[PDB]
Scaffold this active site. Structure first.
Site, mmCIF file in Angstrom:
data_model
loop_
_atom_site.group_PDB
_atom_site.id
_atom_site.type_symbol
_atom_site.label_atom_id
_atom_site.label_comp_id
_atom_site.label_asym_id
_atom_site.label_seq_id
_atom_site.Cartn_x
_atom_site.Cartn_y
_atom_site.Cartn_z
ATOM 1 N N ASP A 60 -5.009 13.951 -25.417
ATOM 2 C CA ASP A 60 -5.009 12.529 -25.111
ATOM 3 C C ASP A 60 -4.184 11.818 -26.188
ATOM 4 O O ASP A 60 -4.681 11.483 -27.265
ATOM 5 C CB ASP A 60 -6.455 12.016 -25.049
ATOM 6 C CG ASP A 60 -6.560 10.547 -24.660
ATOM 7 O OD1 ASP A 60 -5.529 9.833 -24.604
ATOM 8 O OD2 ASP A 60 -7.707 10.106 -24.424
ATOM 9 N N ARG B 123 -0.362 -2.235 -19.149
ATOM 10 C CA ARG B 123 -1.674 -1.601 -19.192
ATOM 11 C C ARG B 123 -1.874 -0.611 -18.028
ATOM 12 O O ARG B 123 -1.835 -0.990 -16.857
ATOM 13 C CB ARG B 123 -2.742 -2.687 -19.205
ATOM 14 C CG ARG B 123 -4.088 -2.241 -19.699
ATOM 15 C CD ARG B 123 -4.945 -3.453 -20.072
ATOM 16 N NE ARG B 123 -4.461 -4.082 -21.293
ATOM 17 C CZ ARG B 123 -4.799 -3.701 -22.524
ATOM 18 N NH1 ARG B 123 -5.642 -2.687 -22.717
ATOM 19 N NH2 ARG B 123 -4.290 -4.333 -23.565
ATOM 20 N N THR C 122 -2.262 6.418 -22.293
ATOM 21 C CA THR C 122 -2.091 5.060 -21.799
ATOM 22 C C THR C 122 -0.602 4.731 -21.876
ATOM 23 O O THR C 122 0.146 5.392 -22.596
ATOM 24 C CB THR C 122 -2.885 4.046 -22.649
ATOM 25 O OG1 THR C 122 -2.558 4.215 -24.037
ATOM 26 C CG2 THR C 122 -4.380 4.243 -22.458
ATOM 27 N N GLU D 159 -0.457 4.702 -0.925
ATOM 28 C CA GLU D 159 -1.266 5.914 -1.114
ATOM 29 C C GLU D 159 -0.408 7.138 -0.838
ATOM 30 O O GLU D 159 0.423 7.133 0.079
ATOM 31 C CB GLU D 159 -2.476 5.924 -0.191
ATOM 32 C CG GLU D 159 -3.502 4.861 -0.487
ATOM 33 C CD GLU D 159 -4.556 4.788 0.586
ATOM 34 O OE1 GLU D 159 -4.182 4.696 1.768
ATOM 35 O OE2 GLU D 159 -5.755 4.820 0.247
ATOM 36 N N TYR E 213 0.855 -1.202 0.000
ATOM 37 C CA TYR E 213 0.000 0.000 0.000
ATOM 38 C C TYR E 213 0.884 1.242 0.000
ATOM 39 O O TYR E 213 1.750 1.398 0.872
ATOM 40 C CB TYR E 213 -0.999 0.019 1.181
ATOM 41 C CG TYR E 213 -2.439 -0.078 0.717
ATOM 42 C CD1 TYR E 213 -3.016 0.958 -0.029
ATOM 43 C CD2 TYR E 213 -3.210 -1.211 0.983
ATOM 44 C CE1 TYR E 213 -4.324 0.871 -0.486
ATOM 45 C CE2 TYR E 213 -4.532 -1.311 0.526
ATOM 46 C CZ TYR E 213 -5.076 -0.269 -0.209
ATOM 47 O OH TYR E 213 -6.362 -0.359 -0.670
#
Lengths: 405, 405
Positions: B197, B232, B223, B53, B51
């Site tokens: 984009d 991905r 992406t 964050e 984790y």
């Protein structure tokens, strides 16, 4: 690893450090776990190369025959594990699973009732700096100031006053069993949907050690990573009547292409959870938490709610005149990983806190038992009662090393 | 794989099928690629257990020293690749990267101007069944009916009429170079932010084969999976003036814990893209697309815009009296993977279409060159001119097999 060491020495060196850190430390962050080598292999597969927008048998693009088999395996195993009528295994995270349920049933500005963030509720249950709090009108119910158990009369009063379209139950730092039947009764009284975010307790639910929200909730959201001990990601469970809407919320609603490699890893984790030995593991998690709670109380610590029914506990550090921030820092010095955490009615800010949150999922996965819980509690007592003694901290450091081998 | 075969025969068998399918077929879906073994190893690492964050050096929880190194490597390599002042490598997907930019600069109901979805724009650029179209008021600019090049006077007129707070440029199916300077000029005229984009073209941009949007756009989203040939996921690039806001949009705004293992894989992919041989690869991609376009025209096919400046092309199937749906299906029968795709001013629905979209990124990664482009074009001609001849389809099938080995 074979190719990464040669291709990228910098990335490899950092990963290896992280691998060694995971082994060396006592990991007590309640949301964390260690996944199996099978789970990681699935995540490291060629399935990352496949665009699979849509759902099994109903994809945007051709060539999805095999990724369809993987996704269906994840969905069917999820339904077996939790007895849900429908599963959506595509959410990239717990955040996106919650996001999709909100997208399904709410319009912008709708009223939602969730658990007070400083009493155990999650960021995605209405934080004013999170999409949830910005997009919808969140109101909060609390725990009792004495018992720290959810005040169900408060849930009821807030629901009847504010007339939420949705009620959210479940938490990131609530150490007791949640009464989903009572939540549904209140939901039914005010004509609200009930969503249960079982992220923390999902592994316990799968093992029959926490009551299952599925029979009582219209929507159940969860992470796969955590007590469920899966890869990092989200999942939504619901009745067949909301299946079409939930699927459309995920795609084309809030996501695009799913992570098929992670979905493979989810299937693997669900497979593991279906086995008898996962049930034994989960019982040790809860047994270890109970034992650790009791041992901490033996050391003189006060716990929020007076103990735990699950994987996690919260130390109220006020009797020791310590903040969660101070405790977190000093424990870090000796190789014990916790996080500062607000306690209910905390006089301190969320950035300081009067508590530390501790969970046993990770250490239980490593093979820690009751004797290890006693020692962990003894080390925590040693450290927190002697924050100014470097010799005490060194002893703690050595006792931590003794435990991790 | 070592542990997955034993732990989960069902998941393993399906993955192996998928692995074999990736090798057997001619993959011409424009958004797809094959990642390196180094990239997959990073994704298959123990970093899924952490984790993290928050951001490097400013995390919610302790023990992030090493994942911080991984994230910083991803961010610094991204900035080197694209010359951006700031990178955020946490977005779970292209969808979430776009979502976070919208969360940053727009309020619910704000007007946004993007490319017509049936002319090349993405779902996340205002589809009424996507969050973008539901949350914000999207208006659209079009391509010229004859040249199929973006009508910049139309971009300008729509901007001046509708007064968007944000203009979006870039596409999922636009085969020509986009003029970002003109987009910024229009943005400046109406006092709108400009978001680009670059998902499809990001690898081409990194290799200097498409103009870089970074100098002209307030925000660049992309992406990592795709022409960039990464894992991905998503990424946001922006000027330092929006760095704090963009970071807060991602967390605590729209996501929770990042996928540190995928972020490791992003760093690896950026490392690969920084090398000289990626530049050569990207030139072969564009060279192959040009060659394939020319060879298709030699076979008698009409292409949208009369060709390509990038990795992708669109066949307008109207002269052959075929729908994209029919073409997609028959090509699937012989082992060629394309997708039906709306062409500008398409008389058919998005579920039928008059076109197929084709890209060369994947086949170029496999080592395909100009001779292979000629043969692929010849096979497509053979199939689409003889949809009713099983013998022609069998010949095509054998010629496809000859190419994949």
């Amino acid at each position: 690893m074979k190719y990464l060491p040669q291709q990228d020495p910098q990335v490899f060196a950092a990963i290896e450090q992280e691998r060694k850190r995971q082994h060396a430390k006592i990991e007590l962050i309640a949301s964390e776990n260690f996944v199996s080598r099978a789970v990681m292999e699935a995540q490291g597969s060629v399935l990352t190369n496949k665009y699979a927008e849509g759902y099994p048998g109903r994809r945007a693009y051709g060539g999805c025959e095999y990724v369809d088999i993987v996704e269906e395996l994840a969905r069917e195993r999820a339904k077996q594990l939790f007895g849900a009528e429908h599963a959506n295994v595509q959410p990239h995270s717990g955040a996106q699973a919650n996001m999709a349920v909100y997208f399904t049933v709410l319009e912008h500005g709708d009223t939602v009732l969730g658990m007070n963030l400083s009493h155990g509720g999650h960021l995605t249950h209405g934080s004013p700096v999170n999409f949830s709090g910005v997009q919808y009108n969140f109101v909060a119910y609390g725990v009792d100031p004495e018992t720290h158990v959810i005040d169900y009369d408060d849930v009821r009063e807030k629901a009847r006053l504010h007339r939420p379209k949705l009620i959210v139950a479940a938490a990131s730092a609530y150490p007791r069993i949640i009464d989903f039947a009572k939540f549904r009764e209140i939901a039914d009284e005010v004509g609200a949907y009930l969503m249960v975010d079982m992220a923390h307790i999902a592994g316990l639910v799968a093992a029959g050690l926490h009551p299952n929200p599925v029979p009582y909730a219209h929507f159940v959201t969860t992470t796969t990573h955590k007590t469920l001990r899966g890869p990092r990601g989200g999942m939504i469970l619901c009745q067949e009547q909301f299946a079409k809407q939930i699927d459309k919320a995920i795609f084309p609603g809030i996501q695009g292409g799913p992570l098929m490699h992670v979905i493979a890893a989810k299937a693997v984790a669900f497979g593991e959870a279906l086995q008898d030995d996962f049930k034994a593991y989960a019982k040790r998690v809860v047994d270890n938490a109970k034992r650790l709670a009791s041992a901490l109380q033996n050391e003189g610590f006060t716990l929020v709610s007076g103990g735990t029914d699950n994987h996690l506990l919260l130390v109220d550090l006020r009797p020791q005149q310590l903040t969660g921030k101070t405790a977190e820092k000093v424990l870090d010095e000796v190789g014990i990983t916790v996080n500062k955490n607000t306690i209910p009615y905390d006089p301190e800010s969320p950035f300081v806190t009067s508590g530390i949150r501790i969970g046993t999922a990770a250490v239980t996965t490593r093979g820690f038992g009751l004797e290890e819980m006693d020692e962990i509690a003894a080390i925590i007592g040693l450290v927190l009662k002697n924050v100014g003694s470097e010799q005490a901290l060194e002893e703690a450091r050595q006792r931590v090393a003794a435990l991790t081998d």
